[PDB]
Design an enzyme around this catalytic site. Structure first.
Site, mmCIF file in Angstrom:
data_model
loop_
_atom_site.group_PDB
_atom_site.id
_atom_site.type_symbol
_atom_site.label_atom_id
_atom_site.label_comp_id
_atom_site.label_asym_id
_atom_site.label_seq_id
_atom_site.Cartn_x
_atom_site.Cartn_y
_atom_site.Cartn_z
ATOM 1 C CG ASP A 252 35.552 -27.474 1.011
ATOM 2 O OD1 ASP A 252 34.720 -26.708 1.830
ATOM 3 O OD2 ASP A 252 35.570 -27.157 -0.205
ATOM 4 C CB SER B 16 20.915 -19.711 11.726
ATOM 5 O OG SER B 16 20.911 -18.667 13.118
#
EC number: 3.4.23.22
Length: 330
Positions: free
Chosen positions: A35, A199
């Site tokens: 994770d 992004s």
């Protein structure tokens, strides 16, 4: 040194991925959920409340000659999906894919929430976010990666998750045969303890690319792709009959649909998520309403590039002095 381990979807939907991890002496192999959005290595154990164990493999520290109780240490964690676990702490030898750390904090669960109990395939979590998020008290502990880093050939790990198929976590090296083209690296903020990056935009299907900054986290422990409501609405508007369902808890779509792809930007590069990666199947057995793999982050407070996004790429988690993230197509 290096390590390399295969990671395997837990079910036919890729709801999560499990990776075998050797703990203790002699080794006890548990299948952990790696994770990159948390920083605790915790396991089902011989100390876990018996009624809260249902099929998981447990760590029994009393059977490990290298286990040592970390005196006075406790831990307690709550995840974004509302699940939680807590307990005490041992140090022990932990190996992943041939890479060994001695003295790793292994957090033994005394209590786990229902969602963990109900998932027989996940024996615990191995956190790979920054150690500043580790919950051990009163002395915070380091992640497996943080402990291994100095020994690694290069201070990196990579995630290469499969679509409906196994993939690979590598530590200490970049497998140049595992991706196509080049790896595009992008800046990371560690301010919130995550692999947080920005992004450069998105496209839906064959549509034009929208240049827009989307701050979010690379999180292997989250199944879906959670993005701003504007972006998510633009995606689902291209699927006839798709709608946001408050009763179901997100966007659903007719199972008869063909889903468009979704592209996200990494610098000037582009990662394409095929439409089929966005199908999470019937909302309930036999239903013709299917659950979408792109969902709104509104009210999460952060955008999350979960497995839906990451499995479309070869992803480098670069733990150099100034961390960065790399993405390549594959």
């Amino acid at each position: 040194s290096t390590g390399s381990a295969t990671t395997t979807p837990i079910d036919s939907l890729d709801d999560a991925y499990i990776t075998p991890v050797q703990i203790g002496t002699p080794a006890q192999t548990l299948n952990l959920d790696f994770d990159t959005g948390s920083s605790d290595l915790w396991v089902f154990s011989s100390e876990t409340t018996a009624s809260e164990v249902d099929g998981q493999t447990i760590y029994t520290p009393s059977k490990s000659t290298t286990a040592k109780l970390l005196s006075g240490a406790t831990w307690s964690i709550s995840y974004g999906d509302g699940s939680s676990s807590s307990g005490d702490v041992y140090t022990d030898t932990v190996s992943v894919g041939g890479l060994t750390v001695t003295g790793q904090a292994v957090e033994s669960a005394k209590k786990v929430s229902s969602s963990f109990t109900e998932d027989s395939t996940i024996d615990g979590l191995l956190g790979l976010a920054f150690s500043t998020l580790n919950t051990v008290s009163p002395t915070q502990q380091k992640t497996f990666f943080d402990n291994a880093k100095a020994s690694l050939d290069s201070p990196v790990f990579t995630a290469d998750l499969g679509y409906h198929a196994p993939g690979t976590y590598n530590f200490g090296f970049i497998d140049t045969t595992a991706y196509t083209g080049s790896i595009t690296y992008t800046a990371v903020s560690t301010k919130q303890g995550f692999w947080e990056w920005t992004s450069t935009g998105y496209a839906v299907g064959s549509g034009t690319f929208k240049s827009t900054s989307i701050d979010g986290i690379a999180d292997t422990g989250t199944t879906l792709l959670y993005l701003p409501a504007t972006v998510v609405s633009a995606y689902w508007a291209q699927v006839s009959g798709a709608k946001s369902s408050s009763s179901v808890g997100g966007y659903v779509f007719p199972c008869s649909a063909t889903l468009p792809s979704f592209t996200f930007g990494v610098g000037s590069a582009r990662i394409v998520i095929p439409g089929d990666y966005i199908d999470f199947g019937p909302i309930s057995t036999g239903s013709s309403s299917c659950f979408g793999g792109i969902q709104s982050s509104a009210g999460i407070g952060i955008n999350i590039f979960g497995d839906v996004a990451l499995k479309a790429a070869f992803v480098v988690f670069n733990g150099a002095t100034t961390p960065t993230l790399g993405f390549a197509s594959k």
